[PDB]
Amino acid sequence: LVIWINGDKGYNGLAEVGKKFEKDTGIKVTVEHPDKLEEKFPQVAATGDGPDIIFWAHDRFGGYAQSGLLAEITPDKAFQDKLYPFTWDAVRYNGKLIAYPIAVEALSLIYNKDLLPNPPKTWEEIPALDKELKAKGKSALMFNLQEPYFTWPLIAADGGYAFKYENGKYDIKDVGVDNAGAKAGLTFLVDLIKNKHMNADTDYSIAEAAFNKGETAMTINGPWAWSNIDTSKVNYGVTVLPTFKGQPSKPFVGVLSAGINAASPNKELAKEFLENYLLTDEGLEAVNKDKPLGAVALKSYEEELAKDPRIAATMENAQKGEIMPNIPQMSAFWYAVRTAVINAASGRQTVDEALKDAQTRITKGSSVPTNLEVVAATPTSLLISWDASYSSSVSYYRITYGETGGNSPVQEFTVPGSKSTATISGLKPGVDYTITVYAYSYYYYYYSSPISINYRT
Amino acid sequence: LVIWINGDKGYNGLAEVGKKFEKDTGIKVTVEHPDKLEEKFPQVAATGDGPDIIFWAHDRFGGYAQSGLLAEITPDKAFQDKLYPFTWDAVRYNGKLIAYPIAVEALSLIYNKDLLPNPPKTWEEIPALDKELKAKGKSALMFNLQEPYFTWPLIAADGGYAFKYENGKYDIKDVGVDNAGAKAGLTFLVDLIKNKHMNADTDYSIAEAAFNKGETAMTINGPWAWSNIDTSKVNYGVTVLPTFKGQPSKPFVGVLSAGINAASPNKELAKEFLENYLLTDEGLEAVNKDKPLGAVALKSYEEELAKDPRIAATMENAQKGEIMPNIPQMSAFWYAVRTAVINAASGRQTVDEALKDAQTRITKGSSVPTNLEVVAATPTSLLISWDASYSSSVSYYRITYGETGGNSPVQEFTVPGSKSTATISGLKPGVDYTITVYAYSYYYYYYSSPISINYRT
């Protein structure tokens, strides 16, 4: 068994779990932490190399899954029960489970216990709190306003959402950026800036420095920031995010996941290392003692880690939050919502006109299918993949390929509408090829804007 | 094969190596020495022209490498063994070998054999030596005090360094300008001026004239100065620099390097001209007979050149010295350290306060990434590059571009954190564009101070 985990993770602790797995199977478990493994993995996976199992944030596993680089796992209903139900959503791609949830990460309210022993429960309290802290040379709250990741929890509190998640599946046409809930949260954000309780230019560096110096009573940040606060000697706590209109703040949730290589011949061995060795209290502890995982998916060991109220706050916020969509369409969400917040916060646009523009940007006419890519290639063949969002509406994909700039009649085949990968063979080495995919409806037409890419073998 | 070498180099000797390469391959080798070729090369390289191979000092190859203008070479472990291990560091950029080391250059102690048949082994000897030479109408030592390049060997002797070089990689946050070793060497320098053994206003011209006239017993200078001394008729020797606190003086090392064009289709031919034709004893001799290379990287021929003790002193000092960093951050080092030495030497600042100010100047909050630049452009497209120092910390770069002064929503794409170049296409001809690069952490924020540039197509 070959395992890839990041260098910042408890890789020596994982090696102790491997030693125990070896101690009663005779199966050698080797743990590697290559540089840039998240870039490395797809380069080696389809082309017959790579590890049996990969550990990474779930926001990358989506790209791996579209290319079919990850085995569909099949854990028991009883094993699933051992883990928090929402974690299973993070590792679901195309209705299939493609990874095991390991750890959970989300933003929390970080407060200065000296300045503010009892931090506010609602966003509505903060203005008045700020005004009283000003009269004492301080501010209530500073955090990264430039990034939708940090500001989305407040915007989502009511209606706000990225893409509706209905039953194991995203509805990429249903976007909740424009709804009255999203307007209410952003309006409140903008009003904080308007009423001089916050500053529109405040970024990550300015927020962190202020809090760690003791200039501001609160910040909004993730577990990664704790180590720098520990060193600052600030008497800090970590707690649930404030409510807005009675509703919990909804941060994006990131899940450290253990996926199994599709090409691996050790799939059953990997199943058992993970299920019956790593995802136990003794498995996760050995890794946690090496380097802390934060909040974990395994209920049993999470109940123990929560003795640390910072880890408990991370879990509470995560459970009130929204799993981070790992679909390619998130990139349109980030760009449009980034612009909207900045434009509303700067006073360049009204909240209404900023989020409207973002909604129409997300839902704008696009490529169908989307994110077509070469995943691996010999000099005579290509492996290609594309996004499967519309598979229910798609009867079949029609794929064409031909030498770029040339005038030969294209070569053509079709693939069923459930499919999202394809092989192209019989090509010429060192030649540019234009690959186009058309998505056909059940009604004899293809959906607007087929997608093409160029690539040289 | 087309080769670019400077006009001051043995270009006719290199043409004889080309004749021999032609004599058993039928491959024509043409050697050109254009004016300002170091400026010329990047202008022509990315835009499809330029030579197959370029010869230049390694301090320029860093800029060529950031833009990806140089092919990664892949010599054998056995071929690498033929050359001095430290030379390979000079031609390493982003962990990759991007050139072949040819010749080596460093400062040495130049002494007058008439005045001083046995030159001092330690810096500590010089004061007493100066006082005895004064009583005879002479001084011990004169050299270029205005430039950190000339004064750094003494400052580095103990702890002093620019950027820690750990394993094929610089740590640009680890700067050794402030450490006690750097304070000790500079203090000793300042004390020489204080005790009237040297003068703070002494520059290159004043040092050279004094030594060549026979007014001073020693100078500190490089091989380039020897020709003028030969003519002065001074009975001079060239030797190892003095120690300081038992430690060797550590001069910056410059390496004449042979790089291969990334755009070249003759990469394997160039590999073999260089490896099996130029970098041999017969190859380097033919060039050396035309015009002397000084100390060379090829162990085998260097052992022969060292029969000349001046060439041997250059090599000995080089091996005790520090490879010249060819990263863009060196420019901050030069400016800050130049000021520090001058300020301490003039008595405007204490040594401690001068080097502290320089340390905080080098490590000061900056652009991330740094040195963003256009490397080549058609009227509809730009090729851009930036510094890759933080690639391990960077998850991805977010690049934006839009018409300057305009108010259109920016166009945006992202590139992986390993990358350091990008293509921007679909632009308008004769229009100003603002290009910004943001470096994202793995924690959903960008590092402080993204970098932007303007450029008209």
Side-chain angles (χ1 to χ4, degrees), chain A residues 1-18 21-22 24-27 29-76 78-81 83-95 97-135 137-168 170-200 202-232 234-267 269-288 290-352 354-355 357-363 365-418 420-427 429-455 457, chain B residues 1-18 21-22 24-27 29-76 78-81 83-95 97-135 137-168 170-200 202-232 234-267 269-288 290-352 354-355 357-363 365-418 420-427 429-455 457:
Chain A
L1 269 176
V2 170
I3 299 171
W4 280 12
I5 196 156
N6 209 41
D8 63 4
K9 302 281 167 274
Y11 60 84
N12 292 130
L14 188 49
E16 294 170 290
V17 183
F21 186 82
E22 191 174 301
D24 71 86
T25 334
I27 295 294
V29 176
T30 65
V31 175
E32 301 165 331
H33 49 100
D35 290 326
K36 297 276 165 192
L37 78 85
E38 85 276 24
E39 288 181 42
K40 229 68 96 184
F41 178 79
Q43 295 166 186
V44 294
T47 59
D49 289 300
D52 298 298
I53 118 100
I54 189 185
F55 283 83
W56 200 264
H58 80 109
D59 57 28
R60 210 64 189 66
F61 276 23
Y64 303 159
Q66 151 180 324
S67 298
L69 307 178
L70 296 176
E72 175 171 30
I73 64 163
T74 39
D76 259 55
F79 177 85
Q80 292 178 161
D81 283 10
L83 277 63
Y84 292 102
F86 77 96
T87 57
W88 287 108
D89 297 314
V91 292
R92 192 179 324 274
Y93 212 87
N94 253 242
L97 257 27
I98 39 81
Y100 290 89
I102 310 298
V104 183
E105 197 176 53
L107 294 170
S108 297
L109 223 217
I110 306 169
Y111 69 105
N112 186 308
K113 290 179 60 52
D114 284 358
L115 262 344
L116 195 64
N118 303 282
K121 285 298 187 170
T122 78
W123 277 97
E124 286 89 343
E125 272 159 291
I126 303 182
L129 176 63
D130 189 56
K131 190 222 179 287
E132 68 156 35
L133 278 162
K134 289 293 161 68
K138 307 289 178 172
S139 72
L141 174 65
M142 295 191 69
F143 75 104
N144 190 12
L145 297 184
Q146 311 309 300
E147 286 306 324
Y149 175 88
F150 287 85
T151 53
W152 188 254
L154 179 52
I155 302 162
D158 290 75
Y161 58 91
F163 307 95
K164 197 87 218 289
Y165 194 70
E166 210 69 291
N167 26 50
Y170 286 112
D171 183 346
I172 69 157
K173 285 181 174 195
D174 189 0
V175 181
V177 162
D178 218 349
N179 64 38
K183 274 130 93 162
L186 184 59
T187 304
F188 191 90
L189 212 169
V190 173
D191 284 2
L192 286 181
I193 297 153
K194 265 152 89 292
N195 292 118
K196 300 285 191 65
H197 301 119
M198 281 197 307
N199 219 284
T202 308
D203 61 60
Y204 186 85
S205 204
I206 295 169
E208 179 174 53
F211 185 87
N212 293 184
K213 284 197 262 186
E215 296 156 6
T216 191
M218 295 171 284
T219 186
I220 295 165
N221 222 324
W224 57 81
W226 300 349
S227 186
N228 280 347
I229 320 173
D230 294 354
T231 300
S232 78
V234 163
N235 189 2
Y236 79 95
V238 177
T239 198
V240 66
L241 298 155
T243 64
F244 174 68
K245 291 157 77 112
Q247 316 300 311
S249 287
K250 297 185 84 183
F252 285 122
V253 191
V255 180
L256 192 265
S257 310
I260 308 176
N261 195 321
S264 178
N266 310 118
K267 292 195 185 73
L269 290 166
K271 262 211 65 179
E272 298 190 328
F273 177 90
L274 295 174
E275 281 191 25
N276 314 318
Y277 282 88
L278 182 59
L279 288 169
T280 62
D281 308 324
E282 330 89 59
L284 299 185
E285 187 160 48
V287 182
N288 193 81
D290 189 352
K291 268 168 274 177
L293 297 155
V296 300
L298 187 67
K299 296 173 177 176
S300 27
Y301 189 65
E302 182 51 24
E303 297 164 359
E304 231 64 280
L305 293 165
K307 260 93 100 76
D308 184 348
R310 303 174 300 158
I311 307 286
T314 306
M315 182 51 79
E316 178 179 25
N317 291 309
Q319 292 189 296
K320 291 161 148 87
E322 167 181 3
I323 289 288
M324 173 86 92
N326 68 345
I327 58 177
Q329 286 87 357
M330 268 316 266
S331 98
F333 174 87
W334 289 136
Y335 170 95
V337 176
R338 180 151 44 233
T339 305
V341 181
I342 291 170
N343 274 12
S346 304
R348 298 170 187 152
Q349 289 191 121
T350 58
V351 169
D352 293 359
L355 286 171
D357 287 358
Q359 183 86 19
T360 150
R361 212 145 41 195
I362 313 310
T363 52
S366 195
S367 295
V368 188
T370 205
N371 91 317
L372 174 57
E373 67 189 7
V374 177
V375 329
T378 81
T380 56
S381 66
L382 304 164
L383 211 183
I384 60 161
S385 77
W386 52 89
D387 182 69
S389 293
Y390 291 119
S391 90
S392 50
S393 294
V394 173
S395 174
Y396 68 91
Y397 298 98
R398 180 182 136 243
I399 305 92
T400 66
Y401 61 99
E403 296 170 49
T404 306
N407 207 235
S408 305
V410 279
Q411 300 274 314
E412 174 188 282
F413 62 95
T414 67
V415 136
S418 65
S420 75
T421 64
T423 319
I424 301 172
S425 30
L427 304 182
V431 175
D432 275 48
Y433 280 87
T434 300
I435 300 103
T436 318
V437 190
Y438 299 80
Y440 280 83
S441 70
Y442 283 88
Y443 305 112
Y444 316 95
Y445 67 84
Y446 59 76
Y447 292 109
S448 271
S449 300
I451 189 164
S452 58
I453 56 157
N454 311 107
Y455 192 88
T457 41
Chain B
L1 269 176
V2 170
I3 299 171
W4 280 12
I5 196 156
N6 209 41
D8 63 4
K9 302 281 167 274
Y11 60 84
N12 292 130
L14 188 49
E16 294 170 290
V17 183
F21 186 82
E22 191 174 301
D24 71 86
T25 334
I27 295 294
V29 176
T30 65
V31 175
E32 301 165 331
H33 49 100
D35 290 326
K36 297 276 165 192
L37 78 85
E38 85 276 24
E39 288 181 42
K40 229 68 96 184
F41 178 79
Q43 295 166 186
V44 294
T47 59
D49 289 300
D52 298 298
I53 118 100
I54 189 185
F55 283 83
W56 200 264
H58 80 109
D59 57 28
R60 210 64 189 66
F61 276 23
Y64 303 159
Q66 151 180 324
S67 298
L69 307 178
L70 296 176
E72 175 171 30
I73 64 163
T74 39
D76 259 55
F79 177 85
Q80 292 178 161
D81 283 10
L83 277 63
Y84 292 102
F86 77 96
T87 57
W88 287 108
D89 297 314
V91 292
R92 192 179 324 274
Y93 212 87
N94 253 242
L97 257 27
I98 39 81
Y100 290 89
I102 310 298
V104 183
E105 197 176 53
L107 294 170
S108 297
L109 223 217
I110 306 169
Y111 69 105
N112 186 308
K113 290 179 60 52
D114 284 358
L115 262 344
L116 195 64
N118 303 282
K121 285 298 187 170
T122 78
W123 277 97
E124 286 89 343
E125 272 159 291
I126 303 182
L129 176 63
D130 189 56
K131 190 222 179 287
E132 68 156 35
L133 278 162
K134 289 293 161 68
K138 307 289 178 172
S139 72
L141 174 65
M142 295 191 69
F143 75 104
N144 190 12
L145 297 184
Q146 311 309 300
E147 286 306 324
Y149 175 88
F150 287 85
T151 53
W152 188 254
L154 179 52
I155 302 162
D158 290 75
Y161 58 91
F163 307 95
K164 197 87 218 289
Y165 194 70
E166 210 69 291
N167 26 50
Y170 286 112
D171 183 346
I172 69 157
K173 285 181 174 195
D174 189 0
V175 181
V177 162
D178 218 349
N179 64 38
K183 274 130 93 162
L186 184 59
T187 304
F188 191 90
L189 212 169
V190 173
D191 284 2
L192 286 181
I193 297 153
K194 265 152 89 292
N195 292 118
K196 300 285 191 65
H197 301 119
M198 281 197 307
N199 219 284
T202 308
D203 61 60
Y204 186 85
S205 204
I206 295 169
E208 179 174 53
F211 185 87
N212 293 184
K213 284 197 262 186
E215 296 156 6
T216 191
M218 295 171 284
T219 186
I220 295 165
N221 222 324
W224 57 81
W226 300 349
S227 186
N228 280 347
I229 320 173
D230 294 354
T231 300
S232 78
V234 163
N235 189 2
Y236 79 95
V238 177
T239 198
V240 66
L241 298 155
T243 64
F244 174 68
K245 291 157 77 112
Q247 316 300 311
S249 287
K250 297 185 84 183
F252 285 122
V253 191
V255 180
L256 192 265
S257 310
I260 308 176
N261 195 321
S264 178
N266 310 118
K267 292 195 185 73
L269 290 166
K271 262 211 65 179
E272 298 190 328
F273 177 90
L274 295 174
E275 281 191 25
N276 314 318
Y277 282 88
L278 182 59
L279 288 169
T280 62
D281 308 324
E282 330 89 59
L284 299 185
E285 187 160 48
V287 182
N288 193 81
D290 189 352
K291 268 168 274 177
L293 297 155
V296 300
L298 187 67
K299 296 173 177 176
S300 27
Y301 189 65
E302 182 51 24
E303 297 164 359
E304 231 64 280
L305 293 165
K307 260 93 100 76
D308 184 348
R310 303 174 300 158
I311 307 286
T314 306
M315 182 51 79
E316 178 179 25
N317 291 309
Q319 292 189 296
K320 291 161 148 87
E322 167 181 3
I323 289 288
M324 173 86 92
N326 68 345
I327 58 177
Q329 286 87 357
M330 268 316 266
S331 98
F333 174 87
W334 289 136
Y335 170 95
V337 176
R338 180 151 44 233
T339 305
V341 181
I342 291 170
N343 274 12
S346 304
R348 298 170 187 152
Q349 289 191 121
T350 58
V351 169
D352 293 359
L355 286 171
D357 287 358
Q359 183 86 19
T360 150
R361 212 145 41 195
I362 313 310
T363 52
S366 195
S367 295
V368 188
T370 205
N371 91 317
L372 174 57
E373 67 189 7
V374 177
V375 329
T378 81
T380 56
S381 66
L382 304 164
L383 211 183
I384 60 161
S385 77
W386 52 89
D387 182 69
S389 293
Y390 291 119
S391 90
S392 50
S393 294
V394 173
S395 174
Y396 68 91
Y397 298 98
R398 180 182 136 243
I399 305 92
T400 66
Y401 61 99
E403 296 170 49
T404 306
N407 207 235
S408 305
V410 279
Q411 300 274 314
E412 174 188 282
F413 62 95
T414 67
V415 136
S418 65
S420 75
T421 64
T423 319
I424 301 172
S425 30
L427 304 182
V431 175
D432 275 48
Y433 280 87
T434 300
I435 300 103
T436 318
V437 190
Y438 299 80
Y440 280 83
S441 70
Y442 283 88
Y443 305 112
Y444 316 95
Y445 67 84
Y446 59 76
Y447 292 109
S448 271
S449 300
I451 189 164
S452 58
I453 56 157
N454 311 107
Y455 192 88
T457 41

